[PDB]
Amino acid sequence: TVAAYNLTWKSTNFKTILEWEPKVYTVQISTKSGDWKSKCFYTTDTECDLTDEIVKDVKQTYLARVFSYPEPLYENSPEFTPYLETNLGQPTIQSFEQVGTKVNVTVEDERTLVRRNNTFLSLRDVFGKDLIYTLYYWKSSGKKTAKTNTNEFLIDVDKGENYCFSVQAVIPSRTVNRKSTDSPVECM
Amino acid sequence: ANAFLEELRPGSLERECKEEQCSFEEAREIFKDAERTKLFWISYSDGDQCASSPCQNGGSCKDQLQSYICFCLPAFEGRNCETHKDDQLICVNENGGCEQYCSDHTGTKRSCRCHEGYSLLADGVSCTPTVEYPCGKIPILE
Amino acid sequence: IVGGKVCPKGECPWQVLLLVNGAQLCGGTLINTIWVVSAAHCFDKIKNWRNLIAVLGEHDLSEHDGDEQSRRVAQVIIPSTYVPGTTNHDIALLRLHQPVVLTDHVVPLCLPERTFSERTLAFVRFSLVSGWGQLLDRGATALELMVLNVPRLMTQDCLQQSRKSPNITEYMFCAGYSDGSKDSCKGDSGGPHATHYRGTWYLTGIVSWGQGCATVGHFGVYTRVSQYIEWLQKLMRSEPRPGVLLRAPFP
Ligand SMILES: COc1ccc([C@@H](Nc2ccc(C(=N)N)cc2)C(=O)NCc2ccccc2)cc1OC
Ligand SMILES: *[C@@H]1O[C@H](CO)[C@@H](O)[C@H](O)[C@H]1O
Ligand SMILES: *[C@@H]1O[C@@H](C)[C@@H](O)[C@@H](O)[C@@H]1O
Ligand SMILES: C[As](C)(=O)[O-]
Ligand SMILES: [Ca+2]
Ligand SMILES: [Ca+2]
Ligand SMILES: [Ca+2]
Ligand SMILES: [Ca+2]
Ligand SMILES: [Ca+2]
Ligand SMILES: [Ca+2]
Numbered sequence: 001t002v003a004a005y006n007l008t009w010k011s012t013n014f015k016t017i018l019e020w021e022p023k024v025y026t027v028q029i030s031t032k033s034g035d036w037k038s039k040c041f042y043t044t045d046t047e048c049d050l051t052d053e054i055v056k057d058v059k060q061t062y063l064a065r066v067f068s069y070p071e072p073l074y075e076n077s078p079e080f081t082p083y084l085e086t087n088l089g090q091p092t093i094q095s096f097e098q099v100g101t102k103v104n105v106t107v108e109d110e111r112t113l114v115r116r117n118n119t120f121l122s123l124r125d126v127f128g129k130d131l132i133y134t135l136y137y138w139k140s141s142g143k144k145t146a147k148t149n150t151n152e153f154l155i156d157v158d159k160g161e162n163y164c165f166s167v168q169a170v171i172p173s174r175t176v177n178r179k180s181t182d183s184p185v186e187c188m
Numbered sequence: 189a190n191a192f193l194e195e196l197r198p199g200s201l202e203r204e205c206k207e208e209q210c211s212f213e214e215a216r217e218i219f220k221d222a223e224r225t226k227l228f229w230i231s232y233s234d235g236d237q238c239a240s241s242p243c244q245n246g247g248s249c250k251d252q253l254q255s256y257i258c259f260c261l262p263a264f265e266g267r268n269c270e271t272h273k274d275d276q277l278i279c280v281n282e283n284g285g286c287e288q289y290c291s292d293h294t295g296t297k298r299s300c301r302c303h304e305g306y307s308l309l310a311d312g313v314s315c316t317p318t319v320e321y322p323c324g325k326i327p328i329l330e
Numbered sequence: 331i332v333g334g335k336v337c338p339k340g341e342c343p344w345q346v347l348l349l350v351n352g353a354q355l356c357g358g359t360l361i362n363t364i365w366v367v368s369a370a371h372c373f374d375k376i377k378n379w380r381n382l383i384a385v386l387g388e389h390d391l392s393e394h395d396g397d398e399q400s401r402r403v404a405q406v407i408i409p410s411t412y413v414p415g416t417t418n419h420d421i422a423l424l425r426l427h428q429p430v431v432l433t434d435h436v437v438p439l440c441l442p443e444r445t446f447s448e449r450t451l452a453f454v455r456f457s458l459v460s461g462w463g464q465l466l467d468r469g470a471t472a473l474e475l476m477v478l479n480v481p482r483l484m485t486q487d488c489l490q491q492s493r494k495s496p497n498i499t500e501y502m503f504c505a506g507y508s509d510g511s512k513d514s515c516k517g518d519s520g521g522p523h524a525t526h527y528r529g530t531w532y533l534t535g536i537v538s539w540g541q542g543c544a545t546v547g548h549f550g551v552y553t554r555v556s557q558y559i560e561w562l563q564k565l566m567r568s569e570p571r572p573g574v575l576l577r578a579p580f581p
């Protein structure tokens with residue numbers, strides 16, 4: 001039996017999956033001062049969904065280990081604080097209305113795996129003022145940008161002329177993974 | 189797509205990529221700029237990873253750039269919601285939910301036992317004291 | 331204890347105190363009216379095996395109250411695999427001459443079943459170690475029963491996280507901090523390492539040894555009780571042999 005190695009966290013919108021090599025195990029996840037909770041009992045997979053355990057407190061920093069079976073042989077994963085590391089999915093432009101010279105560009109409040117009551121919280125509900133969206137629009141050869149504390153943009157367009165748009169979720173405070181990929185392009 | 193003499197018509201993002209499936213050039217024939225055509229192409233051509241309906245047990249699939257995310261119902265976990273929570277009733281899993289001792293049983297459900305001086309209640313998982321001073325309890329706190 | 335606090339009178343009812351010729355010697359743990367579990371090295375230099383006393387419901391070594399119950403130790407059992415002066419198999423089972431009276435201040439700690447202890451208790455992160463030992467590596471013992479909460483580590487981590495002495499065998503596990511802030515200490519040897527799980531306390535450790543007390547880059551080492559459950563259990567159901575000292579075979 002060889003101890004598992006190269007443990008990695010794959011998390012997007014809080015859907016957290018711990019993956020590892022090489023290609024029967026049991027995983028335990030805990031917080032710096034919490035009890036250890038076994039997950040994915042005797043799986044033959046080199047992965048384990050830990051989403052449900054980490055959405056219980058995204059602000060927390062979790063640590064996970066993978067026991068190997070033919071005290072057991074194990075390995076520890078990197079520390080992982082969801083709220084500061086989970087990846088922001090690819091945003092999407094829900095709509096865009098024009099009123100004369102100005103145009104209102106909206107970004108969909110995508111849902112997250114984080115549960116509360118009987119529903120999935122949205123990207124806004126969990127990050128609030130921490131999350132802003134960046135607009136990258138254009139007509140002309142150059143580009144223009146805009147930023148928002150909410151999920152809507154209100155820019156001035158040159159009457160008549162046609163434009164295209166592309167937003168991108170961003171969480172400014174973040175040291176790593178502070179920008180999500182670009183959304184699909186949309187033109188008037 | 190390009191029908192007969194349709195390329196004679198100027199570029200139209202809607203007609204060619206929305207209303208029809210456009211290639212890369214056709215697309216480049218709309219945006220003109222490469223950086224622009226790429227930003228558009230990257231998604232437009234990614235392909236809906238949810239098409240295979242990967243999520244199970246009533247899950248809901250959400251497409252991503254060369255990937256997907258599954259939103260499961262309460263009783264399910266796993267990358268594809270392929271895990272039944274109600275079937276983890278084993279001793280390694282939270283002591284089989286027993287208050288004291290847990291005993292696995294191949295095939296059937298698990299059993300729960302108690303330490304001496306304690307009795308297993310009808311709930312099948314709890315243990316209540318049977319003596320005035322059962323081990324493990326702190327009288328001045330009980 | 332180092333960096334802990336005074337166990338309020340009564341909140342450590344299984345904690346025992348061992349005395350030789352009326353002298354503090356080690357801590358113990360009551361697992362029922364007539365049996366006490368302590369550390370083996372505690373009896374390394376004993377001479378008058380007829381002068382061993384066990385004291386229950388003790389707290390303030392400077393005051394006497396009706397909650398104190400002394401008892402003479404009839405038999406001190408040690409695994410025949412234990413070598414005086416060394417660390418492995420640091421466990422001893424002491425039989426009292428007379429049962430004690432279970433009161434509000436004297437209640438036994440539970441001895442768990444092996445698998446429950448290995449598969450569950452082993453993963454409760456924190457546990458409590460206590461005794462009247464040193465309050466500082468160099469300092470003296472304590473008058474009032476002290477208690478402390480320490481985290482458990484799996485041997486592998488204990489090693490990586492420890493500075494390069496005995497090896498951490500499979501008959502011991504580490505618990506404590508390496509910053510030099512908290513840890514049990516010598517005078518606490520034999521004391522319990524009780525784990526709290528779903529409303530009940532169990533015996534999962536015995537204050538065994540370490541690199542000084544609360545030393546930077548070191549953890550406390552406790553005897554792994556779970557490896558001696560059957561052992562203890564058989565002995566408790568065995569007939570009382572002559573002589574205070576009795577080296578039982580182990581396994
Ligand atoms: C390397 O082995 C030992 C060192 C110190 C202790 C030491 N006891 C002790 C207990 C706990 C720790 C600790 N938590 N850091 C620390 C110390 C001690 O001084 N006992 C006195 C004596 C020494 C050696 C044998 C018998 C009696 C015990 C050890 O082995 C049982
Ligand atoms: C459905 O399609 C997805 C996306 O490529 C694939 O990853 C799944 O395994 C399949 O079932
Ligand atoms: C998507 O969301 C999941 C959680 C379930 O409610 C499904 O019925 C829905 O399609
Ligand atoms: C392995 As150690 C007793 O030095 O922490
Ligand atoms: Ca066409
Ligand atoms: Ca065309
Ligand atoms: Ca159309
Ligand atoms: Ca057409
Ligand atoms: Ca062309
Ligand atoms: Ca064309």
Ligand SMILES: [Ca+2]
Nearest residue numbers: 195213214217
């Ligand atoms: Ca063309």
Ligand SMILES: [Ca+2]
Nearest residue numbers: 235236237252
């Ligand atoms: Ca896609």
Ligand SMILES: [Ca+2]
Nearest residue numbers: 389390391393
């Ligand atoms: Ca006293």
